[PDB]
Design a protein around this ligand. Structure first.
Ligand SMILES: [N]C1=NC(=O)[N-]2=C([N]1)N([C]1O[C]([C]OP([O])(=O)OP([O])(=O)OP([O])([O])=O)[C]([O])[C]1[O])[C]=[C]2
Lengths: 206, 159, 50, 221
DNA sequence: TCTCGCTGACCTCTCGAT
RNA sequence: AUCGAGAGG
């Protein structure tokens, strides 16, 4: 389908194991996958989220939402700071961030803001932290706390359909609806989730 | 050949007595759609801005946000042009998590206002009729199958 | 009287209990009434009719 | 972002059948996943021993009665289906029951075998009413998993539906655990009810091994 | 105009007696 | 086959 959307199917699974394997993998991908994403941002123009800047097409909520949409990879830093200063006429693009060695952007063409008047401009610094899963900004509690999506998965879904092998009719087939943000290959994300789940129960394997 | 071309259940979308669709979600599917699209005051996850329907689904599955939470989501919708082409429109709409999740099965070419309400039987019937008028036969049957699946699943989850 | 009998058995008086989905382990969002109803099998078996 | 590994910290034996298993060092969100997966695997794929065939000398078919026995042959077959045994040697074993005189016939009356261990010699199979009557049956016990009906693949042998799985009930609860100064960790408490055939720790090991064997397919490309 | 015959009022299964 | 007595939809 895409470099971020993939399909994997396991047909010969025993009865009742589809809702075990798929559910476990879905939970691990949703809540346990490690990753780094934007969690904080400070804007000179706007002191608070409620306050609205002048000279930029997108409101503060849209800016925070685009920051949430940003997918970033950090090499060896737990918390890193990325700064963006933009001037002229045109949309504010993720490629405008000053390049850093430890920080990489999978999709440079990610719009954060749209510039309306050349008189106004924004200089913004974003904080990126490595974590696991999705923690809302409300639970985290002029610093703008934005939601952080550490887990690379964008959507995970599984569906169990009966598949019949010769002489056996109760066997189950599992198909995976897997969507990623482009940080890692969705197949490799499935591999990571399976590895994590296997390593969790290593203390019980005979 | 005549069975396939005339008597197939896929070719029997509309009633012969009147133009209303004859296949319609009912019972469990209607209850599931009505549970998804209904809203509640001070539900868990209220007031959060979402980047799309997929984030709404993620917060629902994670247990972070309720299905009836009144949130603000970015929805991209398509409307047919004069020549019939599809042009997208992106905006932030006041909706719920359930309606945002449901929007994923709605085919391209329909307004978001169809799902931005507590869906009863009449609402789903009108939505199916609109889908048939705008898109055609195969999109209507695919949409009906998806609606039935989603209604069954979320009626089971509703308890 | 039914509520009192439920009380004596250490059961909720509403007749509804919290159920969990077997396939996912996720609690159902609403309480579900659970009890013992006398079920009958009728002389209308499918093998006699197929 | 290293993940903690759960450990078997306590296996409590409330009774011969009722047991509780605790898994203390679990991360947040892993308790429910492990509990559900282990509950499903324990309820589905635990092997056990059940009665398959029963041969009674004076009985030709299930829908008959034997003189001096209060219970019908069908009821005797149900009572033999409700028999829990353990075999260490092989899967297939034959048990012979012989008793005479008035009095209930219990599971202790089966002839003693070194391999076969009857966990509950108290429950009755049949009753003898008058002194002259005697009962003599050959019981066949096999090892398997799940429910295998007798309908699915001589005169005088009585096929019995095999409820192989020894697990009766599984309940799991996740509670907070205090490891070092961390409070985000939680513990998984698995509650078991069985027939006495399987060891709860062995049941946990078997379930985890099945889960890992299934997961290795996803681990590989 | 009013009595006065003549007309009309889906599918499936089980049993026994002729 | 037909009739009588039921029954289900
Ligand atoms: N021609 C003709 N003559 C009849 O005398 N009957 C017919 N058909 N049916 C058929 O069977 C449906 C109702 O049966 P029932 O028992 O399901 O009642 P119901 O209200 O629909 O549901 P429920 O039993 O759950 O209350 C009905 O439409 C029809 O097709 C039943 C009687």
């Amino acid at each position: 389908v895409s470099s971020t959307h993939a399909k994997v199917t396991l047909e010969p699974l025993e009865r009742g194991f589809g809702h075990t394997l798929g559910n476990a993998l879905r939970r691990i991908l949703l809540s346990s996958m490690p990753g780094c994403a934007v969690t904080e941002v400070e804007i000179d123009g706007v002191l608070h989220e409620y306050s609205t800047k002048e000279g930029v097409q997108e409101d503060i909520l849209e800016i925070l939402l685009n920051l949430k949409g940003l997918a970033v990879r950090v090499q060896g830093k737990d918390e890193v700071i990325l700064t963006l200063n933009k001037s002229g006429i045109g949309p504010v693009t993720a490629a405008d961030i000053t390049h850093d060695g430890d920080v990489e952007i999978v999709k440079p063409q990610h719009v954060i803001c749209h510039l309306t008047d050349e008189n106004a401009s924004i200089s913004m610094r974003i904080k990126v932290q490595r974590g696991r899963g999705y923690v809302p900004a409300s639970t985290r509690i002029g610093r703008l706390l934005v939601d952080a999506c550490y887990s690379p998965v964008e959507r995970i879904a599984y569906n169990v359909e009966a598949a019949r092998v010769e002489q056996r009719t109760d066997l189950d087939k599992l198909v995976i609806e897997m969507e990623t943000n482009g940080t890692i290959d969705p197949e490799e994300a499935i591999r990571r989730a399976a590895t994590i789940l296997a390593e969790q129960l290593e203390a019980f394997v005979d | 050949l005549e069975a396939r071309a005339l008597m197939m259940s896929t070719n029997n979308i509309l009633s012969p007595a009147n133009g209303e669709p004859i296949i319609v979600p009912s019972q469990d599917v209607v209850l599931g759609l009505y549970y998804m699209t209904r809203d509640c005051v001070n539900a868990k996850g209220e007031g959060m801005v979402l980047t799309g329907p997929k984030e709404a689904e993620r917060l629902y599955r994670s247990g972070l946000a309720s299905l009836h939470a009144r949130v603000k989501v970015r929805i991209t919708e398509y409307e047919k042009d004069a020549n019939g082409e599809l042009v997208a429109k992106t905006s932030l709409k006041d909706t719920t998590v359930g309606r945002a999740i449901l929007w994923m099965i709605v085919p391209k070419g329909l307004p978001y206002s169809i799902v931005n309400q507590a869906l009863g039987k009449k609402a789903i019937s009108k939505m199916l009729n609109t889908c048939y008028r705008i898109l055609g036969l195969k999109p209507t049957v695919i949409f009906a199958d998806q609606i039935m699946y989603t209604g069954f699943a979320y009626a089971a989850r509703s308890g | 009287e039914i509520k009192e009998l439920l009380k004596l058995g250490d059961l909720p008086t509403s007749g509804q209990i919290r159920l969990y989905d077997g396939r996912t382990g996720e609690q159902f969002e609403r309480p579900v009434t659970v009890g013992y109803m006398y079920m009958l099998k009728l002389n209308h078996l499918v093998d006699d009719k197929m």
